[PDB]
Design a protein around this ligand. Structure first.
Ligand code: CL
Ligand code: CL
Ligand code: CL
Ligand code: CL
Ligand code: CL
Ligand code: CL
Ligand code: CL
Ligand code: CL
Ligand code: CL
Ligand code: K
Ligand code: NA
Lengths: 676, 676, 676
């Protein structure tokens, strides 16, 4: 009985082969069903691919159903084959082929389908538009599931239309011609563009017409390899959220935002020929967690300076926990902006295209309040000599109202005699740093202890100083007369800060005793000397001599020729000294260039507690002993204060290169313009 | 041979039609398998739908298996048909129909199934309960994949039970009757409710009994259109995380939290009839990135004031990077709360239901530390006249301990003579703003330069002032005697701040010279005059006259009648003047109402550097020239300080309307109570 | 006709049973296709499971295809069966069995497949390695979809190899032996390990070789029950993002990070035997939103102290919105670190393994700027007597540069006479708290009002004080002579702060009037008295007596014996008094132990406005009335300032236990070393 034959043949383990199937959707349009809900198997969407197959079910009355070439296939007879597919569509359902094929139309059909799209692979496209509240796109990774713009395509790889709201873009890549490290770009391309809204609807969230409320999430999306912008959110769009956005390898601007009312979290922008980020006309937005690196990337060819971040014509921005680092020009340029609030801000090792040239934050006609600032320049710290920022802050105008608090100078050792702020440009702007009172702006009454002048002849001699010192004469300093200023105050455990303008006359071999605590140099001298030593060949050494706590230590270094002090040039010379903490700084007041070193922890043999036992007195231009070395040149504006960190010292230099450090800690301040 | 006929018939491209299938799960329960793992095709869950079909496999011994009407279907004979389904379930598997159908039971079966639920569409429900660590729900968008509460249903659309922990709610909508803009609500509804735990388990995370550790994520979820609450997290629940939560169109309170120990990131709450957010009994929580807008939304009918945010009976809250904007009443009300820490805070343009009536932050028996404050009132800036906040801060009690730092007054031009703080209510609370020393609380010794009184007769005349001025008499100001105060101090590039109480006598046409720098008015006069001009018709003009840097400029405006100065009323009149930066403020000390303007950037023809060349002296009530115009009325409490921004000026007004601006910058302060 | 028989038999609703299928992939390898793209049904991967089945399609020419035991199955004949599977793979496709089975090889095949992996259930594994940019893993919950390390397995449950970048790990669990509350661990296990990179590639993101750019997201992942680490990110890895990471039940360290350049948001680490978090050698990273609780968890057996967070050898860290709470030892230990920036920081109720022993933040050779600090100790507030931190801050070295701002002492009532800072260890470090000038470091000139000494005999008597008071003698205080200091200053609405060193002689029953405002005690006395009352049995009472605003109130408490004042011991005794706000503090200057109470809100019958009407004078050691009670012992270092919160009082104690509170508010300071 051939009946048993058929059952046994169909019942073989490969028996499914005997059930015919549709070869293609083209074949499917010619296959009329004879039963409602009739089941058919589709081998593949397009002949020869083995891609896009599935199961379809029939509506003999295909009325109100439209063929879309993927999930709704209509017959010549008017029936509709409907893909059995509850949830997301993917491009292969609509004829995508992957590989080098142009899958633009299949991908466009997905996001137009009325369902969210799943990217299961990498698809080449030219330009895709997201139009509906169903146009979500989901992948499974930042790389392998992605849209890839064709090399010939220009414009926006993805455009979010002003009719599209409340979608999710999650965990997929958006790659352009330059996606791979060190490759070139197709001109005029953008990864994701959010167009300016052309209208406002009254039926949100069911709107079908233009509306500014994007109210959508771009989450774990990786944009790489575009020319003009990675992501460009144009004016008029509200509530475009980004979350874990990663932007790599952009010829020009990583991310541009020109709109209001949005929040981004954990954004990273890396390696852009121009800015990593442009905020232009932004307001009432939030960035929380941000990393902006390798802006103004030189191999991307852009001659010309561009900062890591431009904040232009913006207001009411709260920007917390971001870092700008390794950018070729300035770190952050704030221009014509109001009320920029930054809480936890890290800017270090920018200006990498030209050493000692650019600044980490550049203020121009802007107001800002910046808290939790940090900026440890790891190139200066390591001593690598790599190009880095001249300093932290630069004011291009003096109508800025700016408050800055944090660690303005980090306080590492200074192997190459530099740190975070190596050129300081003071300003008359309405500026407050670290809550420090600006001496030029205070009427506070303070102590002002009077030192005793001492010399072989005890009559002070006064001589001219350069006009940069802001006075006519200063105290004549000579080795022959041992000119010095003796304070009777002794150093205590709170520590001390000592500073003066010194105009050194540098000729032959010589020891300059700029300032001292106590005298002598031995296990029990309880003394500090800051010295400039010139050997007979002109080599210059800055030496800190410490004696106490049962031992002696020399912390000195030979200056490279380009950092040597110049005869007749005024320098602000400052030290902070306290148990376990010594720093010195020499500041050229005509160029603003600074050298410095700082000693804590393992650099100190002992904390030298006994220097601060209220027994060693303070002396300027020599030590407290009649035989000590003195100085050659001129002194002025001698300052004694209680201990200030180098952080606060540098902060106060932005007010003025030669003024007292901290009015609330001021103990003595002597101009020395023909008086003591 | 009919064998070939069968193979050729089955082998047609539509051959799958010949394989029978089950019409419904009801039919399936009557279909006994004869082989283990036997495969059957289910056409659809419910007859007539074409929805919920799939492939099932048989367990002849359905023992320990329970029929659930979707993925486990048991036969009369005791066998179990198991849906071939590795991962998530969706409501259509359990009989959902979508459209207008009540899909409550299918959706409840999904979240009770033991698998996570995928929402592929919009489903109407009455009330759903999440009970298990498997009760996750995933959608593909904030709108199209959603639960939709039936119009007749009341109560919670979703309840998270105290047995439910460690689930994810990701990328779907939760809509109620009022979801669409401008529609009404069903009474007593809540979007998502997290119930108060009834117990604590000892076997987390495998607990099957009540526990407070929710430890779950609500992520990219959109809640819209509910009455009482969008999201309501009740007391006793720990670690309910929200991430990119979006709440729209709530009749009453957008989000209520009444518990401890949680973190939210990037929350937005928009358009609520009462508060956007209520924190009531909260502690040890974090909000990072928040947008709270259109609270107290008038068309939602709630008569009565409700703030954008209520912080009540809470403690140890860290709230970073949030904004409160466009709310109908106060911005933020902090009541009976300890240790509220805010870092990066934006409050602007609230109080929109009644102009000049509400305040951006209202403190009542609370302590707070607020850093990075900003609040550019875009309505005042644009000059639209839209209703906006009276000012930034209001203290309902004087037992608050509050620190505020930031841009308290933004410093835009003031087209309508107003800005951010238009009514100032000073307080005796333990308050510190912008690190400013409160003059009423300091013993610091400062400079106090003595001006020279000048007049046609050089003997000062003193007359009564209103008691609000805090002294018996002031300096008689007259045009006939040209009463004035001449300081010999000249203005420098750091700038200057000048202020006084002036009680003007306003009668006919007249020029009041409130204060001046230098004298004359020409390309090279290096002068500033602040003037009140009254024309013969009573119209009042506030004019800033600047001469220097080779040109002259008039920055004046006619006051609207409601802003005119009133004869016999005391005003605090203050200016800040420095190169490129001029602001003036007139403050009615009896009503706290302020008018003001500020000039920087393009409003200035030149920076007027030469006004600040240390050649132009300071004068109150006239200028330094014998022929200058003077004033009519009384003067008192003359203040000279180094430059303060309007930001710091306004900040210090919260201490006291008439005291010195900044003790650390004070140069002169003359009461003028029968002395100079 | 047996043809009709076959059609009718196949057409039965169970007709699918007649289509044969493959019993196993082993059977499949022996099934040669005869048509390209031939369809076959696979019943199951492994015989007897009903797991892993599906549909496969044939490539007769299996060339360039490799058998992987799940989705690519090759025949003896060289053909390839390809699983119809567009998107993610799951372990059951590769032979996983779930339950107690070791599914390591199936799971490893998934993440090696070239597709992302979906976890649909809980799978036991030993060790899994993520190697490719396709090795993403997705679950549907933090618990039920998970990897579970076998009890015998050691090492890393998941290792991310240095070839793996740009993947997502989303919404699944990683459990070890100790996952369930209160269970033990397998030695040497780690949840997720990110290995140190062995090289750098030049073709990112298409690299196939080692690279430091992880650039991956760990999102909504739950790690529980491992020994050494929950998550361990080793040196050299960049941009490992965590987002909503939840770590529970770790024998040792919840999370270790030893690398640079990363951002975490909303991390929670709960219940670790050692630290919740170790940052060791970190730099240029961000943590935004963090909860670290129950570190140093005693039942996990680690004898020895470990902080909630170790920050060691790190720099340029921005850590915003975190909380450390309920940890067994110190809260946060910062060692050998630069530029640690914290904005919004909550540390409370740590040190729970030994009461009054540990500190919330411990600084050692580190610099930090901390803003928005809060730390309401809920155990002290509730009066539970549970073990809690001795105090907020401890400095193990004096070379730290630290700025702290916030609510250093919360200001709740003090039911057990304690609060947040119960032992205070002052430091000579470069420290600034709440912007307070350190009196030891200021040269500012202030008022110093001179009191009038009064006694039955009006000649002051001076007697010795302990050396801890920093002077030789103080003012002899006796009840017989009514020794007192009368200021003529009266209290005003701004309030007042009064403090002194008092060395009490405690013998029999006695009333000590430490200090007073006004005199008398009645509805209209407008008076304040701070009293120590000793009854005849030695019981001690600290009483605040308030009279005014029409009533009287006693705010007193009996001290527990262990908190009693000791005869001959010096105490710093301070009050702040203003309308509606009264606090007192008694500080043992030899042990640093403090007791205190604070009265606001409901504790006050009235605000006692009339005490501050400028009519009641200030008195030390008695009141302004000749008959008032006085003191027995010695007084020294009498301080009058304008009102300071207890917050600022405690903050200033970290500078020095006995110095003036606030130099900018200082009104009087009398050493009393043989003078008045
Ligand atoms: Cl073919
Ligand atoms: Cl010169
Ligand atoms: Cl010069
Ligand atoms: Cl039917
Ligand atoms: Cl009056
Ligand atoms: Cl009045
Ligand atoms: Cl079997
Ligand atoms: Cl002693
Ligand atoms: Cl002692
Ligand atoms: K933050
Ligand atoms: Na079939």
């Amino acid at each position: 009985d051939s009946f048993i034959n058929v059952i046994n043949t169909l019942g073989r383990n490969d028996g499914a082969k005997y059930i015919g199937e549709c070869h293609s959707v083209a074949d499917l349009r010619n296959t009329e069903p004879t039963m409602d809900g009739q089941r058919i198997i589709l081998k593949q969407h397009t002949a020869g691919t083995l891609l896009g197959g599935g199961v379809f079910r029939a509506l003999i009355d295909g009325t109100g159903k439209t063929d879309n070439n993927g999930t709704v296939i209509k017959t010549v007879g008017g029936a509709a084959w409907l893909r059995v597919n509850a949830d997301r569509v993917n491009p292969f359902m609509f004829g995508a082929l992957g590989g080098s094929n142009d899958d633009t139309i299949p991908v466009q059909s997905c996001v137009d389908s009325g369902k969210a799209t799943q990217l299961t692979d990498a698809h080449y496209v030219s330009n895709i538009q997201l139009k509906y509240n169903t146009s979500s796109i989901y992948g499974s990774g930042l790389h392998y599931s992605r849209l890839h713009q064709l090399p010939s395509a220009t414009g926006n790889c993805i455009t979010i239309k002003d009719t599209c709201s409340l979608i999710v873009l999650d965990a997929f890549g958006v790659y352009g011609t330059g996606a791979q490290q060190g490759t070139s770009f197709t001109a005029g391309t953008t990864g994701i563009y959010v167009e300016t809204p052309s209208g406002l609807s009254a039926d949100y969230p069911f709107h079908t017409t233009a509306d500014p409320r994007r109210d959508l999430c771009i989450s774990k999306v990786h944009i790489a390899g575009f020319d003009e912008y990675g992501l460009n959110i144009d004016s008029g769009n509200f509530s475009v959220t980004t979350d874990s956005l990663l932007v790599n390898h952009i010829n020009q601007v990583g991310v541009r935002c020109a709109t209001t009312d949005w929040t981004w979290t954990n954004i990273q922008v890396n390696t852009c020929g121009k800015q990593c980020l442009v905020l232009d006309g932004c307001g009432n937005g939030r960035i929380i967690g941000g990393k902006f690196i390798w802006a103004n990337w030189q191999p991307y060819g852009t001659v010309g300076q561009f900062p890591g971040i431009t904040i232009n014509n913006s207001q009411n921005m709260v920007i917390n926990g971001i870092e700008v680092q390794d950018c070729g020009g300035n770190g952050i340029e704030i221009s014509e902006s109001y009320s920029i609030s930054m809480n936890g801000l890290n800017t270090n090792r920018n200006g990498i295209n030209a050493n000692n040239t650019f600044y980490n934050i550049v203020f121009n006609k802007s107001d800002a309040v910046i808290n939790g600032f940090v900026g440890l320049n790891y190139a200066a710290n390591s001593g690598s000599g790599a190009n880095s920022s001249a300093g932290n802050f630069q004011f291009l105008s003096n109508d800025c109202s700016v408050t800055i608090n944090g660690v303005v100078e980090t306080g590492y050792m200074g192997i190459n005699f530099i740190g975070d702020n190596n050129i300081i440009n003071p300003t008359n702007s309405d500026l407050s740093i670290n809550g420090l009172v600006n001496y030029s702006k205070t009427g506070l009454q303070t102590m002002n202890e009077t030192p005793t002048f001492d010399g072989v002849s005890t009559t002070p001699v006064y001589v001219s100083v350069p006009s940069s010192v802001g006075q006519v004469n200063g105290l004549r300093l000579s080795q022959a007369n041992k000119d010095k200023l003796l304070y009777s105050r002794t150093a205590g455990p709170e520590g001390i800060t000592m500073a003066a303008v010194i105009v050194p006359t540098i000729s032959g071999a010589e020891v300059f005793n700029f300032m001292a605590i106590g005298s002598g140099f031995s296990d029990t001298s309880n003394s500090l000397h800051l010295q400039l030593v010139i050997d007979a060949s002109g080599k210059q050494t800055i030496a800190l001599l410490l004696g106490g706590d049962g031992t002696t230590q020399i912390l000195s270094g030979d200056l490279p020729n380009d950092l040597k002090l110049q005869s007749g040039v005024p320098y602000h010379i400052a030290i902070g000294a306290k148990p376990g903490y010594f720093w010195w700084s020499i500041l050229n007041i005509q160029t603003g260039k600074r050298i410095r070193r700082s000693f804590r922890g393992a650099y100190l043999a002992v904390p030298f507690n006994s220097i601060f036992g209220l027994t060693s007195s303070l002396t300027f231009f020599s030590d407290s002993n009649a035989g000590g070395d003195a100085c050659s040149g001129v002194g002025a504006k001698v300052y004694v204060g209680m201990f200030s960190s180098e952080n606060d010292y540098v902060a106060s230099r932005y007010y003025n290169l030669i003024n007292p450090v901290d009015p609330t800690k001021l103990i003595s301040y002597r101009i020395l313009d023909s008086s003591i």
